[PDB]
Amino acid sequence: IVGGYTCGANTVPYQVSLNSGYHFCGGSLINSQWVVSAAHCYKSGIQVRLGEDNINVVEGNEQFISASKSIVHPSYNSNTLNNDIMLIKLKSAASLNSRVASISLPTSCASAGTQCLISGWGNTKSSGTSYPDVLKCLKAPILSDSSCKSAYPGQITSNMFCAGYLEGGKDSCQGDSGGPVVCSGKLQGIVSWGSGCAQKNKPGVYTKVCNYVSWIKQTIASN
Ligand SMILES: [Ca+2]
Numbered sequence: 626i627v628g629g630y631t632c633g634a635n636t637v638p639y640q641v642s643l644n645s646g647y648h649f650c651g652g653s654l655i656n657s658q659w660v661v662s663a664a665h666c667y668k669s670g671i672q673v674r675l676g677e678d679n680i681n682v683v684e685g686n687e688q689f690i691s692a693s694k695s696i697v698h699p700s701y702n703s704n705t706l707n708n709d710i711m712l713i714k715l716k717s718a719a720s721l722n723s724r725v726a727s728i729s730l731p732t733s734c735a736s737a738g739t740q741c742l743i744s745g746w747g748n749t750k751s752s753g754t755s756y757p758d759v760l761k762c763l764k765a766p767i768l769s770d771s772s773c774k775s776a777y778p779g780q781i782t783s784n785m786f787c788a789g790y791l792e793g794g795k796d797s798c799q800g801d802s803g804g805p806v807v808c809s810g811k812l813q814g815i816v817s818w819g820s821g822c823a824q825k826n827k828p829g830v831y832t833k834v835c836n837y838v839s840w841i842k843q844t845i846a847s848n
Pocket residue numbers: 677678679680681682683684687
């Protein structure tokens with residue numbers, strides 16, 4: 626997250642870190658057994674880390690749970706990042722508490738202009754590289770579809786939305802991928818892509834989770 630703030634330990638209790646020997650992507654706990662992330666974050670051998678603040682220190686509220694299954698969307702296209710969503714099943718149910726909690730899925734899609742909370746352990750520099758140890762947060766508005774298409778002509782599908790600040794300076798970034806965009810208490814986006822981070826006229830692009838609720842529900846009913 627570039628231009629964000631320190632969230633505060635466990636104040637984003639649905640935020641997970643996906644670990645394969647190191648943090649590589651975020652995700653969102655949607656119930657005791659299931660995490661939503663980005664398909665482009667797929668790796669074999671994922672351990673889901675819940676209750677994290679500093680990902681390099683055991684602070685006492687973590688639950689580390691292996692993935693048993695990962696399910697990339699049937700129509701994910703890594704070339705265009707269309708359908709950039711994945712489900713991860715945990716080997717055992719998380720113990721839900723004040724610091725480890727699920728986030729609601731949407732019923733309706735989010736409105737343009739809504740201020741959402743984006744969070745992660747990704748790079749905090751727009752030019753160069755610095756990865757934070759503690760969880761970072763950013764408040765960012767959903768941009769209009771017209772504005773998003775203008776920014777990335779020929780590349781925005783109906784399953785994507787833009788959010789952030791066209792003047793630059795505030796965005797998600799590498800390493801935030803797969804983590805949440807929460808709007809009115811619902812998981813409305815997944816950190817997906819963008820040209821660079823926090824660059825002028827290049828806002829972040831996010832998977833539009835409300836297009837996937839029927840797939841999420843039937844997949845979890847079946848696995
Ligand atoms: Ca920790």
